[PDB]
Design a protein around this ligand. Structure first.
Ligand code: THP
Ligand code: CA
Length: 129
């Protein structure tokens, strides 16, 4: 896979963010994550964690996987990096997202994320407390 440039337009919630990609505004949904909705437990914390990660970054990048690049709602489906750190992985490692929505072709980082989930669960972090 390859990392491509983007810039932050606005944080939205734990697993969606609005970025400018190839000069166009797009909402991205983070591959392989399911954060709780803002109105659910750990929802606000997940939104806050992603917001801090993308707002503080000097450089955002998006990385598409091998499969579909947009979902049925027109959201971009990618791995998002903030100063080289993958937000998709970080949310899982901190117990603020579950690994979810693992569809064939878009699962390059599946094993990396499941290893993070196992550690978050062992630590009884957040969702796993
Ligand atoms: C993460 C992701 C979600 N989706 C679709 C499936 C779900 O459809 P439904 O809306 O019919 O439940 C929805 C979940 O996203 P959210 O967790 O943002 O609600 O987005 C994909 O199709 N591909 C994906 O990789
Ligand atoms: Ca969600």
């Amino acid at each position: 896979l390859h990392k491509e440039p983007a810039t932050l337009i606005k944080a939205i919630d734990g697993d969606t963010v609005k970025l400018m990609y190839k000069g166009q505004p797009m909402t991205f949904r983070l591959l392989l994550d399911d954060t709780p909705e803002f109105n659910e437990k750990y929802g606000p914390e997940a939104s806050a964690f992603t917001k801090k990660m993308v707002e503080n970054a000097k450089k955002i990048e998006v990385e598409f996987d091998k499969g579909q690049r947009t979902d049925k709602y027109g959201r971009g489906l990618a791995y998002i990096y903030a100063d080289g750190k993958m937000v998709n992985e970080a949310l899982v490692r901190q117990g603020l997202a579950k690994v979810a929505y693992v569809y064939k072709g878009n699962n390059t980082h599946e094993q990396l994320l499941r290893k993070a989930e196992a550690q978050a669960k062992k630590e009884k972090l957040n969702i796993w407390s």
